[PDB]
Amino acid sequence: QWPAPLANGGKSWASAFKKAKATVTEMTVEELANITSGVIGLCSGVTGAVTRLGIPEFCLQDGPIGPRGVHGSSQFPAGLTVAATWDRTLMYARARGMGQEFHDQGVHLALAPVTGGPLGRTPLNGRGWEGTFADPYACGEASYLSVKGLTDAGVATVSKHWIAYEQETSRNLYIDIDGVSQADIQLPISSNVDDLTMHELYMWSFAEAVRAGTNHIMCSYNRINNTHSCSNAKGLNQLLKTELNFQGGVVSDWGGQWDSVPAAENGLDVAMPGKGFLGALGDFWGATLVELINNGTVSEDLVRDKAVRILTGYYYLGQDTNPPPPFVYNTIGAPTLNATSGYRNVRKPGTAELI
Amino acid sequence: TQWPAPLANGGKSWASAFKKAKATVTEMTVEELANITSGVIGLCSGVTGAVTRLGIPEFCLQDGPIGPRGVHGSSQFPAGLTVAATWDRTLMYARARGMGQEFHDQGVHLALAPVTGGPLGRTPLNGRGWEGTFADPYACGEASYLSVKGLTDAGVATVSKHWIAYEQETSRNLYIDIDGVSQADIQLPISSNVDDLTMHELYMWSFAEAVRAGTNHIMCSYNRINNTHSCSNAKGLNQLLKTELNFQGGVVSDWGGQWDSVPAAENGLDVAMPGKGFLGALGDFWGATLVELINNGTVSEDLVRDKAVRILTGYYYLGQDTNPPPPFVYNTIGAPTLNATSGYRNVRKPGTAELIKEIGSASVTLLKNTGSLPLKHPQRIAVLGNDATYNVLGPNACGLANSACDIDNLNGTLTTGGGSGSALSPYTITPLEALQKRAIEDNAEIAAVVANSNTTTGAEDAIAALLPDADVTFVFLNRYSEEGADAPDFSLGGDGDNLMDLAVTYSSNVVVVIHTTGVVDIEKWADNPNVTAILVAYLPGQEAGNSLVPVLYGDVAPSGKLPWTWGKSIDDYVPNGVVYTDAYSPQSNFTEGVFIDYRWFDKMGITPRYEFGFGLSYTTFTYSNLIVDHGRWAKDYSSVMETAEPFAEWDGTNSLYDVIFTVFATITNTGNLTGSEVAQLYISIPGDNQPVRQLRGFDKIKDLPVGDSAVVTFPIRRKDVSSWSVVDQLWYVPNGDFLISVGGSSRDLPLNTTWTP
Ligand SMILES: *[C@@H]1O[C@H](CO)[C@@H](O[C@@H]2O[C@H](CO)[C@@H](O[C@@H]3O[C@H](CO)[C@@H](O)[C@H](O[C@H]4O[C@H](CO)[C@@H](O)[C@H](O)[C@@H]4O[C@H]4O[C@H](CO)[C@@H](O)[C@H](O)[C@@H]4O)[C@@H]3O)[C@H](O)[C@H]2NC(C)=O)[C@H](O)[C@H]1NC(C)=O
Ligand SMILES: *[C@@H]1O[C@H](CO)[C@@H](O[C@@H]2O[C@H](CO)[C@@H](O[C@H]3O[C@H](CO)[C@@H](O)[C@H](O[C@@H]4O[C@H](CO)[C@@H](O)[C@H](O)[C@@H]4O[C@H]4O[C@H](CO)[C@@H](O)[C@H](O)[C@@H]4O)[C@@H]3O)[C@H](O)[C@H]2NC(C)=O)[C@H](O)[C@H]1NC(C)=O
Ligand SMILES: CC(=O)O[C@@]12CO[C@@H]1C[C@H](O)[C@@]1(C)C(=O)[C@H](O)C3=C(C)[C@@H](OC(=O)[C@H](O)[C@@H](NC(=O)c4ccccc4)c4ccccc4)C[C@@](O)([C@@H](OC(=O)c4ccccc4)[C@H]21)C3(C)C
Ligand SMILES: *[C@@H]1O[C@H](CO)[C@@H](O[C@@H]2O[C@H](CO)[C@@H](O[C@@H]3O[C@H](CO)[C@@H](O)[C@H](O)[C@H]3NC(C)=O)[C@H](O)[C@H]2NC(C)=O)[C@H](O)[C@H]1NC(C)=O
Ligand SMILES: *[C@@H]1O[C@H](CO)[C@@H](O[C@@H]2O[C@H](CO)[C@@H](O[C@H]3O[C@H](CO)[C@@H](O)[C@H](O)[C@@H]3O)[C@H](O)[C@H]2NC(C)=O)[C@H](O)[C@H]1NC(C)=O
Ligand SMILES: *[C@@H]1O[C@H](CO)[C@@H](O[C@@H]2O[C@H](CO)[C@@H](O)[C@H](O)[C@H]2NC(C)=O)[C@H](O)[C@H]1NC(C)=O
Ligand SMILES: OC[C@H]1O[C@@H](O[C@@H]2[C@H](O)[C@@H](O)O[C@H](CO)[C@H]2O)[C@@H](O)[C@@H](O)[C@@H]1O
Ligand SMILES: *[C@@H]1O[C@H](CO)[C@@H](O)[C@H](O)[C@H]1NC(C)=O
Ligand SMILES: *[C@@H]1O[C@H](CO)[C@@H](O)[C@H](O)[C@H]1NC(C)=O
Ligand SMILES: *[C@@H]1O[C@H](CO)[C@@H](O)[C@H](O)[C@H]1NC(C)=O
Ligand SMILES: *[C@@H]1O[C@H](CO)[C@@H](O)[C@H](O)[C@H]1NC(C)=O
Ligand SMILES: *[C@@H]1O[C@H](CO)[C@@H](O)[C@H](O)[C@H]1NC(C)=O
Ligand SMILES: *[C@@H]1O[C@H](CO)[C@@H](O)[C@H](O)[C@H]1NC(C)=O
Ligand SMILES: OC[C@H]1O[C@H](O)[C@@H](O)[C@@H](O)[C@@H]1O
16 A cells, blocks of 8 residues: 655754664663553643653643643734734744743643644635635745744644644544544544645645654544545655655644554554543553554554654754753643643743734 | 374385384373473483383484584584585585484484574574575475485484474574563564465475475474464464375474473474473473373373374384484583583594585685685785684583673684584684695795784784785684574674774785675675685584685685575665564564565565675686476486375376476586586576576586586476465466576576476
8 A cells, every 4th residue: 555664864853863763772562652642741742751761751732823721921923813924034933932932831842833734725714723824835935934933942843734624614533422432423524635636735835844844743633535634544654754755753633543553554653642631532552552562463663663753853852951841731621630730931022022 | 273183104114113103102101102292301402201111212302403412522514504505415415424423323313403494594694594504495405305314314313493484583482481480471482474375485395305305303493373383383283294295203392382282282293392301491381281181181192192103203214223322421401400420422433524624615605706816825824813713712612502602702713603503523623723734835924813803902003014014814704693693784793894994904915714604794895906805614613724725725626606695785685584573472474475585686686796606616617508308307206205295287196206307508617727616507487476586406517627518417396397376275387488597606597498388
C-alpha cells in the first residue's frame, strides 16, 4: 500500500535526529508506549516521561493565539487578524511573542499554528478565524512565518489540522462517554478530494509549514475518502512523510484516533490525549500498544520511529540542556482534573504594543 | 497436529537395524522407554539413559561439527566454512571421515554434527554461520551429503543440525530456568516465519540430502517457526521431515530447545536433551514426567515406543552392539557443573595432520593479486598482527568452547570459531613459524609485530621502523565470532583496522591474510595500490601456517573460491537479517523468499566486491565446448535412504534424484603456470519471482598443466530442474526456457545455452 518511511533528521535536525535515535535505542517497549501516548497533567496533552533515561513529560498546550487557560499572559490577535495586516514582519513578530509566552509558561509543544486546515472552503467555518487567508499562497507565507516565530522562541510547533478539515459540522470526534460511543452514532464527515486539488490547494500551506521546520503535525478529525485522517496511509505515510519528506511527529487531534493498529501502521506517532479527559476520547495505545508489540502484531521498530520523531524536536530546540520551566496552571478544569494552579507572570514590555 | 506422527519402518538401508530396534523396544517397561528418550548426567555433551536390563548402554552424544569438542588427544580440523571453500567433494568426505575416526575412537555414539542447512546463510552476520558450508542450497546439499556419509562410514551416528530456518543467534532464547530466572518469562525464541515455497526450495534442500545420505538423527532448532517451537512443530517434524522426507531416524532437541512435555511428545520430538545434564537447568520435560504421561493416558505408549525405535535403529545399523565404541574418558562439561576427573586417550592418526593441511591449501582463496604473488625469495620480510602467532594464553586458553577469553585478549591465529562447534588443538602451526622456516631456507630475515598495535607502548614506532625496508609486508587479520551472538557488523576484530592503516602508510607491498568466520569490511584498503594481494584463509584448524605458506610461495597455486557473497556493505544484503527486539514474541518474516546471499544480489542488480564462487589462481582458464547430453541419464540407486518427496512425473518406478541429463565443458590452462580450477554450472529455471540463476553443479580439475585441457562434467538431477508447486504440493519441472551457464564464478560465465523440454 504505502509504507512508513523512516525518519532521518532531514536538513536542520541532523544532529537532533541522531541524539533521538540514540535515546530511543535504549528504550524498553513500555518506555516506547509511555512516550507515544498521552498521560494526565495540567496541559492540554502530556507525553509520558521516560523517567529512567531522564526524559520528562512534554507539555502540549493550546493554542494558536497563545497559551490557553493560563493567567499572567497576553491575548494576542487571531490568525485572521494578522492575515489582514498583509505584513510578514507582523506575522513573524506575533508568533515570536506567542512563542516566548509559551516557552516561559513551560510549554514544550504548542498546538499551533493553524496552517491550512481549515483553509476556508466555507465562509461559515466556525473556527476559520484561527487560520489566516482563504488562499494557499498567502496562507503558506503566514504559516511559514508563524512556524518560524514559535520555533525561534524555543517551542516545538504542531501545525494543524492535516488535512481537508473544512467543516466543524459532524467532525464527530471519538468519544465513548456515558455508555454511548460516537463510533456507534456517526462517522466523521469524509472530505473526498481529488489529487490535483489536494496538491495545489490543501497541501500547499503544509508544505510551507514543513519547510519552516514545524516539528510535528496534527492529523484532523475528518475522514478523507472515507478513511480517518489520523490513520490514512496515503495522507500521512505517502503525501506527508514521503512527498513532503516530513521528519517530525504526527499528533492525533483530541479524539482524532479511532483505532490501534491502522493508526500505528498508517502514519500516527502520538496518541492524544490518552489517559487525559478520563480516557473518554479514546485510549487506543498505551497498554494496548505494549500488548500489540509483545505479541508480534506491531513491529517494535515501527514504534521506535514514532518515538524518534517525538524526541527530534526535544533535542533540536535544546529542551534537554535548556528545559522549559514548570507549567503551573490547571488548563483542563475540574472536575475533569482536580489540581490546584500556581501563578506566573509572563507578560513582557513590548507585547502590548505589538498587539 | 492434524499432521500425525508416522511410524518408523527403517526405510532402505536400515531394514535389519529397525527390526532389532522394534524387537528390543517391545520388551521395554514404561520406565525404560522414558530412561532412553531423555538425557542423563555424564561426561559427554549429552547421554541417553541406559536400559540396563536389556543390555543397552548409555549413548555418548558429543559436540563436534569439526570433531569431538572438549577432548585432548585429537586434531583440530578446519571448519565447514573452510571445506566449503575447497569446492572439493574428495576433501569434504575425507574431512568427515577423519573427524569420524576421532569421534568413534574417543568413544562417541552420536556426533552432534554436521551442520546441514541451519544456519544456511540468510544473514552474513550469523555468529555461527561458519559451522555450515555454503550460502547455497545445492552446494550445502552436496557437502551435507558427503559430511554425513564420512561420519557414518566411521561408525558414528550423525545428528544433522539444526532443523530448521535457524538463521540468527540473536533471541534464539534457548529454554533455561536457573537462578530464579526462566526464559519463558522474558522472551520467546525468534519466529522464522517462512512461506511454503521458500521452505521447500531453500531450507529443506540440504536436509533432504542429509536424509538421503543416511543421517541417523536430526536436531530440532532453538527458533520457533510460524510462532511454534521447532522442536514441537508438527508440520515441521511430523509432516515435512518424517513424512515428506520420509525420515526414519531420531529428532534430538537442541539443548534447551524443548519447551514442553506433551506437544513435544505429540508433534515430533524423539529425544529430550540434555535432561538431567546441566543441573536440569535447560528443562527436563520428560523422564519421570513422561512416565506419568504414559501411565495416566495422556501420551500413548505407542508414540514413545516409536521414539525409542528411532533412537535404537542407528545403534544397531552402525553395529555399536557387536562392535561397541571404547569408553569416553574426558569431562567435557566442566566443573562446577560436573565435577569429574578426566582420563587420557590419544586418537591422532598418521595422515590427519596432512589432510588438515591439504584442506587449508585447497581452501585459501586469493581475492586480489596485482603482481606480488607468488613470492620468489624475498630477503626482508615484515609481518603484522597477533593473528600471525599464538594466543598469548595458549591455544586452548579460551576453554571447552573457545569462548571464555577476555574481549581484548590476543587470541592468536583464528583456527576455529567460538562455541559448541569448536574443539581443542594439540598445537598451532602459526603463520609466523611457517614464514620463518621459508625465510631461513632463503637466507632471509623476518620480523613480526604481534602486540596490540593500539595499546602496546612502542608498537606503532616499531611498525614505522620495520616496514619501509621490508621487501614484503604480510598482514594477518582476524574476526572471531561465536554461537550465542551475531556479529554487530563487518568490523575486523581486535586492532585490525589500525594494522591496515599503518601498513599502507609504511609499505608499498602489503599482502593481507584474513582468518575469519565470515565476510569482513575491507573497503578502506582493498582498492589501495599498496595492498598488492588479499587472501582469506577462513578457519584452517591446527595447520594454519604450513597450509598457507606453500601457496604464498607458489609451491601450489591457490584454487579455493568464495562460498558466499562478499558485499561492499552489509546494507547490500537481505534486510532484517538479524532482528533486534525486546518484544515477548520476536518475529522474523522471511519475506525475501528464496533470495538469500547471491540470489538477492543477482535479482536486485547489486554488485558485490567479490561474488559467490570467486577466487583467483596464479593462471587463467578459458572455457569452451559446452555440451548438453540428454542421452546421459541414470537411475538413482546410490542414496542410503529415500525421501517421499512427491513429484508430477512419478511414474511409479522413477525418482526425484534421477539424473536426467549431463552437461560437459572444456577448460584450457591459458596462462603460464599449473593450477587447479573450480568449474561451476548455474541454471535459470523459468517461473515467477524466480532467481536469476542457481548453482546446480561444480567440478574441480586438479593441477591442469599449462596448455592442457580437461573436460568438466555436471550430472543434472530432476530435482535440480524442479520447482515447488504450492497449489499442488509436489515438485515439478516447469515449462519455458532453462538457461544453463558454466564458468569460473557466479558472475564469470562464458558458456551459455537454452534447454526447453
Ligand atoms: C482520494 O481519492 C481521489 C480520487 O480517486 C484520489 O485521487 C487519485 O489519486 C491517485 C494517486 O494516489 C491518482 O493516481 C493516477 O492516475 C494517473 C492517470 O490519471 C496515473 O498516470 C498515475 O500513475 C502513475 O503514478 C503511480 C504512483 O507513483 C505509479 O505507480 C504509476 O506507475 C504511474 O507512474 C509512472 O508513469 C508516469 C508517466 O505516465 C511517470 O511520470 C511516473 O514517475 C511513473 O513512471 C496515478 O496512478 C489518480 O489519478 C487520482 N484520481 C483523481 C480523480 O484525482 C486521491 O489520491 C485520494 N486521496 C487520498 C488521501 O487517499
Ligand atoms: C508457515 O506458514 C506458512 C504461511 O501460511 C505456511 O505456508 C502455507 O503452507 C500450506 C501447506 O501447509 C500451503 O497450502 C495450500 O494452499 C494451496 C493453494 O495455494 C492449496 O492448493 C494446497 O492444497 C492442498 O494440499 C493439501 C496438502 O497435501 C491437501 O490436503 C489438499 O487437499 C490440497 O491438495 C489436493 O489437490 C491438489 C491439486 O489441486 C493435489 O495435487 C493434491 O495431491 C491434493 O489431492 C495447500 O492447502 C499454503 O498455500 C502456504 N502458503 C504460503 C504463504 O506459502 C507454511 O506451510 C508454514 N510452515 C510451517 C512449518 O508451519
Ligand atoms: C545456556 C546454554 O547454552 O547452556 C549450554 C549447556 O548445554 C548448552 C548447550 C550449549 O551448546 C553449551 C554446551 C555451549 O557449548 C555454549 O558454547 C555455551 C554457551 C552459549 C553459554 O551460554 C550462554 O552464553 C547463555 O546465553 C547464558 N544465558 C543466561 O545466562 C540466561 C540466564 C537466565 C535467563 C536468560 C539467560 C548462560 C551462561 C552461562 C550459564 C548458563 C547460561 C554456556 C555454556 O557454558 C554451556 O552451558 C553450560 O555449561 C551450563 C549451562 C547451565 C548450567 C550449567 C552449565 C552451553 C557455553 C559452553 C559457554
Ligand atoms: C536409566 O538410566 C540410568 C542412567 O544410565 C541407569 O543407571 C546407570 O546404569 C548403568 C548400567 O546400565 C550403570 O553403569 C555400571 O556402573 C557400576 C558402578 O556402580 C559398575 O559396577 C558397572 O560395571 C558399570 N558398567 C559399565 C559402565 O561397564 C550406572 O552406574 C547407572 N548410573 C546411575 C545414575 O546409577 C538406570 O539403570 C536406567 N534405568 C533402567 C530402568 O534401565
Ligand atoms: C578472543 O576470544 C574471545 C572469546 O574467548 C573474544 O571475546 C568475546 O568477544 C565476543 C565478540 O564476538 C563478545 O560478545 C558479546 O559481548 C557482549 C557481552 O556482554 C554482548 O553484549 C554481545 O551480545 C556478545 O554476546 C564476548 O562477550 C567476548 N567474551 C568475553 C568472555 O569477554 C574476543 O573478542 C577475542 N579477541 C579478539 C581480539 O577478537
Ligand atoms: C511512563 O510515563 C508516566 C507519566 O509521566 C511516568 O511517571 C511519572 O514519572 C515522573 C518522573 O519522570 C514522576 O515525577 C511522576 O511522579 C510519575 N507520575 C505518576 C503518575 O506516577 C512513568 O514513570 C513512565 N514510566 C516509565 C517506565 O518510564
Ligand atoms: O454547541 C454548538 C451550538 O450549535 C448550534 O448549532 C450548530 C448548527 O445546528 C449546525 O451548523 O450544526 C452544528 C453541528 O454540526 C451545530 O453545532 C446549536 O445547536 C446550539 O445548541 C449550540 O450552542
Ligand atoms: C495482541 O494484543 C492485542 C491487544 O491486546 C489483541 O487485540 C490481539 O488480538 C493480540 N493478538 C495476538 C495474536 O495475541
Ligand atoms: C509479518 O507479517 C504480519 C502480517 O502478515 C505482521 O503482523 C508482522 O508484524 C510481520 N513482521 C514484520 C515484517 O515485521
Ligand atoms: C474531582 O472532584 C469531583 C467533585 O469533588 C469528583 O466528582 C470527580 O470525580 C473528581 N475528578 C476526578 C477525575 O477524580
Ligand atoms: C498426567 O500426568 C502429567 C504429569 O504428571 C500431568 O501434567 C497431568 O495432569 C496428568 N493428567 C491427568 C489426566 O491425570
Ligand atoms: C561441583 O563442585 C562445586 C564446588 O564444590 C559445587 O559447588 C557443585 O555444587 C558441584 N556440582 C554438582 C552438580 O554436584
Ligand atoms: C604507499 O606506501 C608509501 C610508503 O611505501 C606511502 O608513502 C604512500 O603514501 C602509500 N600510498 C597509499 C595510497 O597509501
Ligand atoms: O543483546 C546482546 C546482543 O549483542 C550482540 O551484538 C548481538 O549480535 C546479539 O547476538 C546479542 O544478543
